[PDB]
């Protein structure tokens, strides 16, 4: 019985919540707080351990962008700090290839990173890899067929519909086909042989549209849209379905969790988070 973990987030200020949803029985479970509140972070899993990467803490004391990598062990319900990233990365994107965690883009103060770095859990070390062709914060990242995709985001001036693919064996990036829509802070994940980009912000409105890149056709297509417009949403995959969690719709911080079944091209509302929030990190184990 694998669970959907949601870490951190934003509502009034950056948050410390770690909660777990069980889709097969609809229950939520409150787990140990993050040591430091964070929003705009990302979550991923390696070898049954949950990692929370980057983000920022906007609080009464001011703002501090995070270079933190922290590791939560579901078996002990304990957080452990890991080696810091080379630089703080707010609104980071993250993906996993061959047991390594790739930290992509994001921001530190006013610097919008094109840089990328890779964590090896067995050594507790970060190493720089080739930088992206574009500076991207609020970037969505997905891994399919041991290739890493960075989609959308914000370069410091414009929000982006562009996307690019990283090839680890040659340590190089190339542009792929651009999305149909500019999306900053979209939900990006992989289901089956497609990369989905759900929601985000286009510079004017929050979006409920969801487009997917089929890697065999190199084409982006709109599928069924979400019920809720949402940016800074969490997203993940559980048992061949996409789960999107929370976000901001332009007026409300959502507690809604919607579920997409690609067999039927339909979204249904499956649960609610215990309170509304945006900017979460999400993963499954």
């Amino acid at each position: 019985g694998r669970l959907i973990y949601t870490a951190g987030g934003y509502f009034r200020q950056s948050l410390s919540y770690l909660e777990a949803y069980n889709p097969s029985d609809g229950t939520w479970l409150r787990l140990a707080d993050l040591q430091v509140p964070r929003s705009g972070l990302a979550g991923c899993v390696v070898g049954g351990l949950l990692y929370a990467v980057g983000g920022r803490n906007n609080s009464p004391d001011g703002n501090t962008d995070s270079s933190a990598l922290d590791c939560y062990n579901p078996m002990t319900n304990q957080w452990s700090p890991c080696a810091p990233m080379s630089v703080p990365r707010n609104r980071i994107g993250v993906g996993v290839i061959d047991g390594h965690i790739y930290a992509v883009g994001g921001s530190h103060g006013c610097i919008h990173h094109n840089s990328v770095e890779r964590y090896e859990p067995e050594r507790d070390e970060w190493h720089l890899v080739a930088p992206m062709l574009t500076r991207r914060i609020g970037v969505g990242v997905a891994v399919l067929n041991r290739l890493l995709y960075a989609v959308g985001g914000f370069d410091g001036t414009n929000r982006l519909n562009s996307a690019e693919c990283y090839y680890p064996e040659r340590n190089e990036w190339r542009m792929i086909t651009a999305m149909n829509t500019i999306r900053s802070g979209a939900g990006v994940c992989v289901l089956h042989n497609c990369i989905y980009a759900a929601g985000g912000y286009d510079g004017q409105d929050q979006l409920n549209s969801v487009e997917r890149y089929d890697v065999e056709t190199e084409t982006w297509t709109f599928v069924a849209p979400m019920k809720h417009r949402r940016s800074a949403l969490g997203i993940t995959v559980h048992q061949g379905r996409i789960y999107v969690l929370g976000g901001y719709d332009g007026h409300t911080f959502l507690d809604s969790v919607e579920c997409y079944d690609p067999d039927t091209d339909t979204w249904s509302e499956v649960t609610r988070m215990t309170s509304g929030r945006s900017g979460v990190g999400v993963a499954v184990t």
Binding site: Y10, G40, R91, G138, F154, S184, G185, A232, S278
Partner: peptide, 4 residues
């Protein structure tokens, strides 16, 4: 994007 003040909301995260």
């Amino acid at each position: 994007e003040w909301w995260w």
